[PDB]
Structure formats: C-alpha cells, structure tokens
C-alpha cells in the first residue's frame, strides 16, 4: 500500500557482424521513464528528461569518466563477448518434433506440429501434403521463450483427414516427421 | 542486430531489495543473490567456463541504493505507477500421460518487480519441488519472471498458478489441467 520508488541502470552491448561493429549504451531509468544515457555512437552523456539533466551535465565534466565510457566498447563489451561466446553465441540445441491430431470441439479437425526444446530461436516450420507445401490454412503460437535457454512453438494445420519439416541451425539437414 | 548482452540491475525502496544480472538475447547468463552473497549461473555448465565475483555486484548495488535516494528526493517523492502483470501457463513439452514434464508459470509485462507467487495442486499449495528465475528485463523496461514445477501428468490433478501483484485488484489465478 506504501508508495514505491525504482531505479534501473541498464548497461547494454549490441554486437554486429560478430564483433566488427559494437554499440554500447549506459541507460538509467527512474520509475519507468528513462532519464540519462551514454551512447557509444553519440560520444557523451545526454539527458532524456529534465530529471537526468544534472547527472548528464556533471558526468560530462569528468575527463576520466568520459574516457572510461568511451573505452567500454573495447574494454567491456568485446571483452565479455569473448568470455561468454563459447556457450552462448555458439550454443546449439536440437528440437524434438511431435505431430498429433487435435480437435477444437467436434474424427477431429486439425493437425499439430509440436517443436520443443531448441536453441537458438530462429526456426523454419512448414507443412507438406503429398509433396506439396500447404501455404494457407495454418495457425501458430509464435516463438515462446521457456526461460531456460530453450524455445518452443506449435504450428497447427486445419484440415480434416502429411509431413512436418523443421529447419534449424542445430541440424545439418531438416528434421521431418510424417503422419 | 544479431547479439545483445545487458548488465541489468535495480534497487527498490522502501523494500530495500536489489538485483544484478547479465542477459544474453533475452536469456539470463547469471545473477548474484544479495542475501546469500553468491553468483548463480543460470545453467550449472556455464560456471565451468567463466567466473564472476559476487562482491563486485554487491558494491554496485550499494551505489544504486545511494543514487535512488537522490532521485526520489530530486523528484519530490513521486511514486512509481503499478503496471499489473500478464500471467499464462504452459508445459515445457507436449503432455504425455505419466511422462515427466515441467509446468511453466510465465509472468510478463509488469512493474514494480515485487510478486508473490504460489503453485496449487487441487487447491492445495505446493511448497517443495518449486524453482524460479529472478526478475528479467524488457525493452519497454517492465519486468518478466518464470516459475517452474516438475510433475507427473495425470487425469487426477488440476493445477493453478496464483500470482499477487500491487497492480492487481484481484489475485490472478491461472488454471491448467491435463
């Protein structure tokens, strides 16, 4: 019931083409609203609300804080990348591919391709009947984060009675299950 | 474009609770627990490749505490406005009869990062066997959290995820059954 007050620093590194281009943000949030940020592509601190002004003004006046901030892109981001790269950037987990029929209230009325426990997120799930791709007549849950470094999705085809084809970085050739 | 690592922290008053975590593309690498003063890797196997000294993050949070109290006063004590969470419950994988699984309570799109959570089986609170993540960040700067309950699927049990938050007038009671 008491009033609450919240303070989020966010220190982000954005990696492009591997490590060839890096963008570092130092971002500060009072309650929900951002107030002040350092942006590697800008080169100094900027206020984004009037609250963050004295912070931005004062940090800008310090040669060493500014020198440190400008270094982060190399001395922190590129550092950290090389440390975690092995088990994050190069992480690869095979999906498990189930197909079962389902209902939505009637045999019954749609087929479900279930693809679970994969990493990374990027995936291509597609339906086939007799070699032909069924482009229209299918719905999805989208991509779902499980929170444990695996994704899952359900791609459903609505036709009353088939091949599910799953392409993914983890496998050298697409996974099929037939029904 | 392709990869993003964020050092994400907060401090909250008057609860006096802070967090510190690293995030990779929306997944926790690790966090440090203030209470136990130890660094916890999201996957056991991470810790074999990298180190982080917890006492660094503890030092960072002290400053965060200090700084929050400046901004509260600077703002003439304007409180955060509660955004109520959005709860949904799904299974780790396709549900087979009496084949081991995990229920996931997915708590999304909320602020501030305080949440009371209870699993119920058949209306009876489940204390032991539970597991949870810390508060994960979002690009819109709300929070996100996962609760987990491993289980044997059966006709016998119904399950619920009871979530309390200050934005909610009513405790949110999300149902799952076989």
């Amino acid at each position, epitope marked *: 019931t008491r009033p609450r007050f919240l303070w989020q620093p966010k220190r982000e590194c954005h990696f492009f083409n591997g490590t060839e281009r890096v963008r570092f943000l130092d971002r500060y949030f009072y309650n929900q609203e951002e107030s002040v940020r350092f942006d590697s592509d800008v080169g100094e601190f900027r206020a984004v609300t009037e609250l963050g002004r004295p912070d931005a003004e004062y940090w800008n006046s310090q040669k060493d804080i500014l*020198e*440190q901030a*400008r*270094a*982060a*892109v*190399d*001395t*922190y981001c*590129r*550092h*950290n*990348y*090389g*440390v975690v790269e092995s088990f994050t950037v190069q992480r690869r987990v095979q999906p498990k591919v189930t197909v079962y029929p389902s209902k939505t209230q009637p045999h019954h009325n749609l087929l479900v391709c279930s693809v679970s426990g994969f990493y990374p997120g990027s995936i291509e799930v597609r339906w086939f009947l007799n070699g032909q791709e069924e482009k229209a007549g299918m719905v999805s849950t989208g991509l779902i984060q499980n929170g444990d470094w695996t994704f899952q999705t359900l791609v459903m085809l609505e036709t009353v009675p088939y091949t599910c084809q799953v392409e993914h970085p983890s496998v050298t050739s697409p996974l099929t299950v037939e029904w | 474009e392709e990869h993003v690592i964020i050092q994400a922290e907060f401090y909250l008053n008057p609860d006096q609770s802070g967090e510190f975590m690293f995030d990779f593309d929306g997944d926790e690498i690790f966090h440090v627990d203030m209470a136990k003063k130890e660094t916890v890797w999201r996957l056991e196997e991470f810790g074999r490749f990298a180190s982080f*000294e917890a*006492q*660094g993050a503890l*030092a*960072n949070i002290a400053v965060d505490k200090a700084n929050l109290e400046i901004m509260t006063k600077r703002s003439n004590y304007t409180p955060i406005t509660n955004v109520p969470p959005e709860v949904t419950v799904l299974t780790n994988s396709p549900v087979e009869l009496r084949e081991p699984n995990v229920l996931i309570c997915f708590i999304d799109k909320f602020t501030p990062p305080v949440v009371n959570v209870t699993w119920l089986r058949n209306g009876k609170p489940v204390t032991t066997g539970v597991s949870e993540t810390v508060f994960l960040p979002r690009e819109d700067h709300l929070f996100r959290k996962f609760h987990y309950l491993p289980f044997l699927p059966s006709t016998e049990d119904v399950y619920d995820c009871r979530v309390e938050h200050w934005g909610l007038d009513e405790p949110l009671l999300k149902h799952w059954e076989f």
Partner: T-cell receptor
Amino acid sequence: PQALSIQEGENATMNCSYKTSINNLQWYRQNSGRGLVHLILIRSNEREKHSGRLRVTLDTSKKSSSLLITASRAADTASYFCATDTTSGTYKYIFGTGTRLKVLP
Amino acid sequence: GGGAVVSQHPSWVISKSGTSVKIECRSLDFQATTMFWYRQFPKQSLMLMATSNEGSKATYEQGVEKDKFLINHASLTLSTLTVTSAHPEDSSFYICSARDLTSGANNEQFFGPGTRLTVTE
C-alpha cells in the same frame, strides 16, 4: 630482459612490447630494491595520451607501446616497465620486458 | 571509498635457510577480492607467481614451484604469502598488488612498497 638507454637533457623514447590482445596498459618506473611508481595508463581503444612531460603511443597492430619523456631531468634515472591485462581473460596484469634509463647531466 | 593504498610487511627479512618466511599484503583504504604476488631478481623483470583469491585456490602462474610457498587469502583485506622452506636461491625482491573490486571493467590495481628478502646458511 633489460635494454639500456643513455642521454643528457634530451628527449627519451622507450619501447615496450606485449604478448596478448589487451584492455588496459599501464606504464611504471622503478628505482632500485623497492620503488614502483605508476606513471600513466593507455587503453586498447586509444592511440595517444598526454600527461605532464610524458606521452604514450599505443599501436595494437604491432602489440607495442612507446613512452616519450620530453625534458629529461637527472632524477628520471630508473627502470621503465609496462604492464598489461589480457582481454577476455582474468584480472592479472603481466609485465613486459623493461628498459634501464640513465640520464647524465 | 575513492582511493587505495596497500601495505606490505615485513619490509626486510633475514632468515636461516630451512626456516619459513611469512609476508603480509594488506589493503587499507579499499577491499580486494584478489591479490597478486610478484618476484624479481637483481637484473631481471617482475615474474608473476600466484594469484590469491578469497575462497580459496591459489592458481600459480606457469611456472614456478607450486608449493614451495603457501598463499592464504581469507580476509578480503589481507593475503599472506608464506615461503615454506626457503634457501639462498630464494633471496629476492617480492612485491604484492591488489585489485580494487569496485573497479570492474577498468581493472584497477595497486602495489605495496615491497619485501626485500635475503636467506643465509
């Protein structure tokens, strides 16, 4: 280890190579027995840095730094070392091979 | 905080060959999770020898006689290098440094005055 460099009141330029990719590089001077005075630090993104009579080059291409001390006093006589932490590694600083400097009046 | 000095004691040592020698490295203004022991002989440069860490293990650089010394770091302010046996060949300059744990990315460390040990038969 230890290269020797001798002069008068002129400019002194001293070189210091290192074995790994880097984050921070710090220059030190040492007298005899004890000593260890921190002089300056240049970071793996910066090329040039000026402080007092001292000036530091860094060329991460050739993994090499240069220390230029400009109006050399007698009391500049010392060993000059530079120490570096390796990027994506531990906290450790490792010491490069050094130069002994003698400034004669 | 906002500052850092480290103290190394004792400054000079004379021990008989066969006796243990104990050196203390203290951070006074700041806190160290991790400290570093360097050895140096008359002409040559500073060899890093061990890293000490609060709980527990000592690492030891390659290399480097591993456990002809013991390192104890269980203080967050104090790391102890004890040379177990000590012979004339160990007569050296020893010097410790400590990383401020507040520094993070800009990896800030500070050196003690040193210890000037000589062992005689």
